[PDB]
Design a protein around this ligand. Sequence first.
Ligand SMILES: [Zn+2]
Lengths: 330, 173, 122, 103, 64, 119
Amino acid sequence: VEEMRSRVVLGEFGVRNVHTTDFPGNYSGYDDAWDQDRFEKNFRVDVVHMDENSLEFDMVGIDAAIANAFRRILLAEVPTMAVEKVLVYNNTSIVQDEILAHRLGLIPIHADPRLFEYRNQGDEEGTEIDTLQFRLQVRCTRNPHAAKDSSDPNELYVNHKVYTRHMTWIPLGNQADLFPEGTIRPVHDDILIAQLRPGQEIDLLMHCVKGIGKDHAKFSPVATASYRLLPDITLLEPVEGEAAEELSRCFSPGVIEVVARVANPRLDTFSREIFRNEKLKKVVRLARVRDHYIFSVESTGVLPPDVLVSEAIKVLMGKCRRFLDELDAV
Amino acid sequence: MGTKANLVTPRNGEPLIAAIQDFLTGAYLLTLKDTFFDRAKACQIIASILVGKDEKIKVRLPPPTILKPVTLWTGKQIFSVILRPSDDNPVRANLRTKGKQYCGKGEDLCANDSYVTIQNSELMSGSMDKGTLGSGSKNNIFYILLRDWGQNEAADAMSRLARLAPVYLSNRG
Amino acid sequence: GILFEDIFDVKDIDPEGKKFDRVSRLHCESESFKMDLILDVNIQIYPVDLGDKFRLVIASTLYDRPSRADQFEYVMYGKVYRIERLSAYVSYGGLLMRLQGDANNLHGFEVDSRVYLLMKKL
Amino acid sequence: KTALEMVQAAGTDRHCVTFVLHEEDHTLGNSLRYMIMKNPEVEFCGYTTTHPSESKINLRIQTRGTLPAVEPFQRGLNELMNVCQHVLDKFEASIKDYKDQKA
Amino acid sequence: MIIPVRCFTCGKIVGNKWEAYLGLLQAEYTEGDALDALGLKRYCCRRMLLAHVDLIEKLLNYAP
Amino acid sequence: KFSSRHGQKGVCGLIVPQEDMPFCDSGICPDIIMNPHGFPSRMTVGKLIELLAGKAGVLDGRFHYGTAFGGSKVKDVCEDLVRHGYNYLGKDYVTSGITGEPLEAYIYFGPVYYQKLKH
Ligand SMILES: [Zn+2]
């Protein structure tokens, strides 16, 4: 009689409706055969809470298959620049060479991609159109005004800790297009690379390349790029008389109002505490809307997150125009 | 000494090469009476079985077992695609047996549904236990496909299930 | 083209206790033919309750272009697979039907043949 | 040499082809599967990775009538590219509206 | 050894949150809400500071 | 070979990319997907509590003692997940990485101490 192919329903032991189930000739009476202007009208994007290094826009009105492209494309197919070859000179640190050279890899780099191109051949020399070199020269001694205390900031601290402030930029070529903080070493200047004791050196050049995130996860532009369907919670029965404040502490705190009203459902983490109550579990069905999700992009800081998403859509479109031109050849 | 020849141990005659662990609990959860797939998920689970000597067959999805209110397949109808994926496949497997947690009374009509009946490689009733898919029973299908239809069809239907049943289970969780 | 039809009264929604969340096995009785049937019905799409008169039609064919028999509102598709007062076991993928009794009106049935259900409430 | 079709038989059947899309994975397959399943003339669409070692998917399209197993595929991308054109513009019009509301 | 500069699961930049974390534990701050002050929401990035041991200040002693 | 601090050792059979892996709601994709068939024959229920005592442990900033014959019981660990908005058994609702639809059943989820060993 009534069709919730539009809500997944979360039981106590399983998640019930799950698969999309809306294609031609599945639900009789319903014509769902990809009307383009119907999708064009029922779709909007509602942005909530975009500061630096976060984004929580919505994208209401697409299936969870194309939404799992934009999560996946953000995660491992939007390119970034990261350190790939660490040309090492004298390095007398106690940190091992590869583990240093691996820890230089995970540092993000504020120079945005799509100014540069990929590295074509092996090409370990770089061509200043592909790469971006960095220098790291730290040699720590004792400071002369050190007191007798064993405080490592006070004594032994010329450069006891190799932060990413010590990395600098060797402009490879013209490199006048980018400005002074233009290639701000590691997006974060507080990252601890290694620790030293006096008489120890770290001297190394670096090479940065433009890499897909699926090649290696140090190229990943985003911390987490997950998404989640917007929940909607329907009290089938009116709840009042101290069972409302019982249902208040049952859910997430901000979600509810006190009679009982489901004030704001978007803030609900799925603890599923109702089924512990043994009385209200028959009262309210909890559900999540299928075509209304909540994206949550938090960039590492290479590109601002409103330009990560608009790049993520831009390379999915490029992935299908790459194939549509294959059929034009054939 | 090929695996397609030594499917059967020489102590009993039982088959030793048959599903283990997840494939059994994959295909039990798929052929369980409650599952229903729409043509979304049905063509997705089925089209997992199309690589590696299987990519050149016109895979025939069977007509769905619910038509009018919503149309959707059942789980056992997709397990029949393992035994006979194409149209021109000559396999007609037949098997009727008891199962684990057997209902005791009732031949095949009781609600516990632990009674397998395959007619012409179409799972008609019952759910696939270990005793109808695993190793040690002389009435699992891979033993029945061995004796009646050669040993190439038993190794294909066993290498179909190993490809199909994790693809269902990793999306059913 | 109809093989068999009558009005039925569902008497036990699930006889031995709910075993599945989407399928419950009905026990019904006919009107003046006295054909017992034990039918499984997907109840999530088509909920049924105790003591509910519902039509039931078994057809070999349904005759969107040929304009199907769609006055009914619950249509399955499966094959007969056993004939044992005859029982007549029909399987609908996994959903069993054990229409029974009085073999003169059951005459249209055979074994290994495709069979539609066309149910409807009343 | 990315996309390549697989003939069903030596005689050749256009009602069912098997597209092998190189160097890709579910990121496209599961989003193109959906946009080509919403076609009313496809009775079977589905994809599988051959192996996690190599990188390719095997999309298989089977139509109803005489669909050349290429015309839904060339319309699966064209509907998806029109989506990614639209969802981008609705995204950039909304960030530009959110930033201005914060000022 | 030393603090791994990423989370292993998500990859939040967490290597720059060690001496900022140790500066918090030097004060009154409890082990719990110290990581809520550094912006560590999920637990997988929270275990990279909580379950981490710092051998590198101890190895340095035996490395003249 | 990895072991799992309960004698359930295991060769690392497959290394999937991160984007093919069942992320939960808050974003946490797993590191080591463990098969659940190691449990009902081995009956290592002590592993199933480490995914609970660990997951409540990191969320509170606390190291839960599970010693022999004592330690932190389940009836007080489970009511610590509820304060941080988690399921009181630890089974968290995930959505699948490959297909994008949510998984049909909830997935147990948490940090347990995996020690690599010298094979
Ligand atoms: Zn993380």
